[model samples]
Each structure stands twice: as structure tokens, then as C-alpha cells.
Target: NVMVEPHRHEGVFICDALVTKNLVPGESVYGEKRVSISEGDDKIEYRAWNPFRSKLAAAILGGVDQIHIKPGAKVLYLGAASGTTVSHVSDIVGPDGLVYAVEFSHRSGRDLINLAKKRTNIIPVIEDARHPHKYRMLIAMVDVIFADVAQPDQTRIVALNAHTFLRNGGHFVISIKANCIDSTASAEAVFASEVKKMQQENMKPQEQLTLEPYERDHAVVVGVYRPPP
Candidate 1:
């Protein structure tokens, strides 16, 4: 009689990765176990990753109109860190829409590329947001330019992109971190100053919402590319 022995397999339990679906118009996908859809409706739905937990995700849910970048719309996403927000934006735009995702960090760009592989609509452009013309070939007149680049010159970065890619009367949504703009000043003060800067660039500020609990001392500003009647 052969003696039976119990054996246990021990190694890194790497399950087969779930192939991420390339988001398309009227299609939905699961992200972080949250349902995300781009169903022809003007609005896009996604599981809101709390920023208090995940600042960027919380900021989007807090109240950002540009969060709903729809199908067929050309979008310029600035500071696409790890492509988390960019991924969601790609879904909203769908396959017909084009997203020019720009990231400065090579490490983060690698992740962005990985994400782009799943969503062809997203064109991962590893470059600085300051020079919009450098990647002009990859872009077209965009309907919306959503920027989350939290630098002191972030407003300028957005203005340059708007001047180059945004169509007249288009929209520009920016998430401004108060500390990034001016650590010495109050958040409200910094937001006001940033708004002034946008006005000078011909981006008429329309609505402004404070991102509370989701993000600390942060705000999202929605402005029109040109003066609206």
C-alpha cells in the first residue's frame, strides 16, 4: 500500500488577471468593483473613489461638470497620474471620442500606457502639458479640456492647451489645489486668484464648487473657452 501524503502548493497566488475592457459608447465596465458606464446619456457614471481615501476620485464626485466628458468629444487630460482619472475619462468619451492623456512622470506614464492599451480612445502622450503644440498632431479641436495639473502655473498650462485645441465656446474644467497654487494664502484666496487668471485668458468662469471632505482645500472650476452670451 502506498502512503498518501498531504501537500500544499505555496507560491505567489497570482490569479488570471481580468482583462480590462476597452470602454465604448453605450458600454459599461467595473472599476474598483464600482459600476462605470458611458450609456449614450449625456452624463457618465462611475464608482466614486473617495479622495479622503482617493483624492482625485473624490474630487470628480464632489462636483465637476467636466467629469462628464462624453462620446465623440476630444479631451486633453493634464497630469494623468497612473491614468486613474484618465481611464474613467476615456470611458466617458467612448471609442468615438479621443483623449489626449499627458503625463510628465515616466513612471506614471508607464501606467498610463498600460491603461491606453485597454482603451484605444486614450492616446497616452508622455510629455509636459506646457507645450501643447509639440503634440498638436495627436490632437484636434476639442470640445472639453479637463485639467488636474496642480502646479502654480497650472492655469497657464490649461490656457495654452485651450488656445491650441479647444474650439470656440468649448468648456474647460480645472481642479485647483489651494496648496499647489499658494501655500501661504487661504484656499478661497487662491481659488479667486486662479479664476482671475483664467478670465485674462478669455476663459469665462461659469461655476465653481468646493471639494469638501473628498479633498482638502480643493475646488473645481468650470469655465467656457470663450465668452458666452
Candidate 2:
């Protein structure tokens, strides 16, 4: 009996370890495990959200608090590579939710574009996150921004998007790759520096979790956007 149980976070379930209700029931994204359970005569499907492949998944498994990317939520996903994580995100959001997936590289953007074809909830924005206005018209106010850009100026990029698209009091979940930020600095120090950068941009961090056992020298910061009074 493959019974699906809901995780502490809404829209995410645990069947074969962290699965999302498959938005496209028949299709499998990224070849992740998919489970189908018969509820009465009808069948429900879910896909495993692998932490090793996704920083957000790693954060979730690591017990990071407040994902903020629940059902019906509008999310702006920075650095959506090949839509691996974005596919799971699309599943979480369901039909009512929307995921504005932004990726700078066209090579990977092609994959996102293709992924969006089946998962209609995902709107693929093939543009640089540094310049949010270029694709500003393509997106509306979002509830959360899940950034995994892994760049030296990643916080700045998130801040720029926050100022443009993130609604007041909206939350953000950022996956910080320490090596990408500063290889010379200690991971803890790099994380602290990134937190300070967020503070300067009116982003108040609430929870910080390291993606240990899954990712090395990486942490995810959860926060809220509180504009200056």
C-alpha cells in the first residue's frame, strides 16, 4: 500500500521520500520516482522531489522553516536550471498556482521552455535575473522568490527582483553556495555576509539552514521583505 502523507509544508507529500502531486499525472519529469495510489476507484499520482538534485529540496529535508511556496502561491524562481526543481515546484503550485521561472542561460532555458509546455503553471522567463525589468512585463507580484542563482551577486539579484516583483511582506528562500560567493571565506562567514546583504535590501531573514549531507558549503536563507517606513 503506497499511501501518501503530507509533509509539514503544504502541497508537499512523502510517499517515496518527498513527492509532489503530479500536475501532469501521466508524465514523469527528470525521471524521478512516481507513485500512484488508488483512492476508491480513482487514482492519484505524485513525484519524488529529490534533494540531491535541488537545493530547495535539500533545504526542506534539512528541516528549514517556512518554504512559502505552497498551493495557489505565485513564485518567482531564479536560476531555474533545466527546470528539475521547477518541475516539482510546478507540481506543488498545481493549476491555480503560478511559477515564474527565470533563467539566464538559453541552453538550459530551452529545457524550461519544454517543461512549461506540459506544466502550464510554469511561465519560463529566459532572461538574466540581474535585470528584472527586462522581463518585468512577463510577471506580476509574487508571494515568494526561490533563488538558487549561485552567483557572487546573487543577493543583489534577488533584491532587485524583490523591489520589482515581490509584494510587501512577501517571503524569500535563497540557496547560497558559499564557493560561488567566496571560495576563500569560511562557509559560515559567507552565509553571514549574505545575510547582511539581504538586511541592507530590506529583506529580513527569519531562518537559516545548512544543506548538509546533501550539499557542501551551502545554506538556505528564508526571509520576508519589509520595505522601509
Candidate 3:
């Protein structure tokens, strides 16, 4: 008694809730719930994506227009802690796409590396996002970067990687926690300042949305880098 429906955002599906087509059928990443439906003789599986756990899920549920990460799209994810969100991103990108997940902490990197073993599309890099030079050789020019670094200087971190790995005119989706950046300032003010930082780095933000209910004082921004002329 279940049905899977296509979401407006490509590569995402709705099955009573947000879900992604499981890249590896019969595999459950992060212990999230999985749903299987029959389409004639074929069986399709989907994994539930919790908005509480993933800012991207919150953004999508919150009605963001575009995510820019679809099947066959290459993505570089910063602060890919423990591969919870990375797993869903991998599911969205499928086999043809690549998810280069970067994390500075070894504990989380260990889990990320392990997740990559099961999901071939994910490439786990145990490195700091701020120093893209160290792992630049390991990553190709990616179509989009999803950063959840939560650092005070996360804008600079994304910028560093954007210049190093993100192709010209590539897109970026960054999740900003106001408290992580500047708790003293109003959330709106913090978001504006962060947008200014992106501007300085040639990242033009197209839309900005706050993750309320799911998250407080947090913002998810979708933007383009180095616009093609």
C-alpha cells in the first residue's frame, strides 16, 4: 500500500515523504528507512531522506527551486560528516555521477571511507576543505559543490575549493548555521554578510532560504560561480 512519486527536483522522489532512488538497491545507508515498490515486473527501492538530519533535505522540503545535483552530475561535498547526507547525494547522482566527500576529522573520515567502499560513486577524501590544494589532484573539476562545513570562515573555505575544483560557471549549495558563523549578529544579518563573502569570491547567489522548524538560524543558499560570458 505505498506509491513513489517523482519530485519536482530531478533525482528525488516522494514516498509519503522525501526519498531518493537507492543507487545500491537493497542497501540502507545511515540506517534510514527504505521503501520498495513494484512497477509491473520491476521492483524499485527508495531511501527516506530526513530533513532533520540533512540541510539539503530541509531546503528541498522548504521549497527551494533547484538543487543542481542530478544523475551523472559531479559533486564535491565539504564537511561530509559521517556520510549521512553524502549517502543521499550519492543516491541522487547515481553510478555515473561522482561525489568527492571531504572531511578533516579522521573519525568521520573513517566512516566516509567505509561508505565509499559500498557506494563506488563516492570518493572519500580525509582532508580539510580549506586546503583544496592538497586534494586538488584527487578531484576533477566538479559541476557543483555542497558545503556544510559550519565554520566561521566557511565562505572562504567554499571559495578556496570553488577556485580549485569547481569549474567556471559551476553551481554551489552551501548550508550556513548562523551560530557557527556569528551568533552575536542576527541570522538575517549573518546571511547577508555571508552572501557578501560569496560575491567577493565571484559566487553569485540566486536564491536564499532559511531552514525553519527543521533548523533554527540556518540558511541554505544556491548560487553560481564565475558566470560564463
Each model's total of backbone clashes: 3, 0, 0
Residue 102 C-alpha lDDT in model 2: 95
| Candidate 1 lDDT, 27-133, residue by residue in tens | 33324543333445644333332355334355444544444366567888888878776765675566788888889899999988887776788888899899877
Error of 3 at 111 (Å): 1.0
TM-score of each: 0.77, 0.97, 0.96
Q: lDDT of model 3 at residue 171?
A: 98
Q: What is each predicted model's overall lDDT from 0 to 1?
A: 0.70, 0.92, 0.93
Tell me the lDDT of candidate 2. 0.92
Is 1 or 2 the stronger prediction by TM-score? Answer: 2
Off by over 4 Å in 2: none
- Which should have the higher TM-score, number 2 or number 3? 2
Best TM-score among the predictions, by candidate number:
2
Q: Write the per-residue lDDT of candidate 3 for residues 5-67, one digit (tens) a residue.
A: 889988999975999998888888788999988879999889999999999999999999989
Name model 3 segments beyond 4 Å from true.
Answer: 227-229
- Per lDDT, the best of the predicted structures is 3
